[PDB]
Ligand binder design. Sequence first.
Ligand SMILES: Nc1ncnc2c1ncn2[C@@H]1O[C@H](COP(=O)(O)OP(=O)(O)O)[C@@H](O)[C@H]1O
Length: 243
Amino acid sequence: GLILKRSSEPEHYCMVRLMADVLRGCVPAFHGVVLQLQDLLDGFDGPCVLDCKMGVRTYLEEELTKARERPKLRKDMYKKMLAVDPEAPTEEEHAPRYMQWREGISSSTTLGFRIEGIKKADGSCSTDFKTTRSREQVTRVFEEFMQGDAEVLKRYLNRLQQIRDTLEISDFFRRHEVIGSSLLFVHDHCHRAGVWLIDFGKTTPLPNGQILDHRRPWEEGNREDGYLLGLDNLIGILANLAE
Ligand SMILES: Nc1ncnc2c1ncn2[C@@H]1O[C@H](COP(=O)(O)OP(=O)(O)O)[C@@H](O)[C@H]1O
């Protein structure tokens, strides 16, 4: 039971180091370049899955610089910033920003994480959470996803606390930008449950010896991502649901 990504570099490398970091248990086991990863669904019966995009900012600060010169005008995304609302400029109307617009209507800006999608035992799938922003709304999606199973919620919380601790002493995590990865929640009707970090497509190293705090606000040079601020809240939201 395995899975093959489509190997990119910041990820292969992100993987060649995680299998050597204290975070090894918090991510899919990596199995060389024969990308050969562990299938996190293999141990469940009818897998229920929820992918949480963790972070205050969802684009590499570097993608913003490189974007300051060359334009990336995709007309599809602007079909996106319109059919949702008129917030779009007269310049856009007639011709990163999308992502940072997505962060505000979403939950990434007010609590560093955002629900990307869900898969059920057989309720198929949904990615319709673009405006899920408030804490009450986040809980509602989680509350439904769990279906009253308190044993699953207990296990998800215990794992989040354990992940949080590992992240705080991880030197790898410490020396990196990490943007666009997710916390993938998985559980089944057998009460089985697990949580892992995935997506190391973005995630880059900082200057010689420089480190990130992962909780303070981002400013042009910070390269800060607010990842732990997102985890602090996600845990907060699940601990209250536990009542
Ligand atoms: N190791 C894995 N085991 C099982 N399912 C996975 C695994 N990695 C990814 N998935 C599934 O693939 C989706 C996208 O993976 P991700 O790394 O985020 O790809 P991309 O970077 O193209 O978005 C996840 O939300 C999840 O449903």
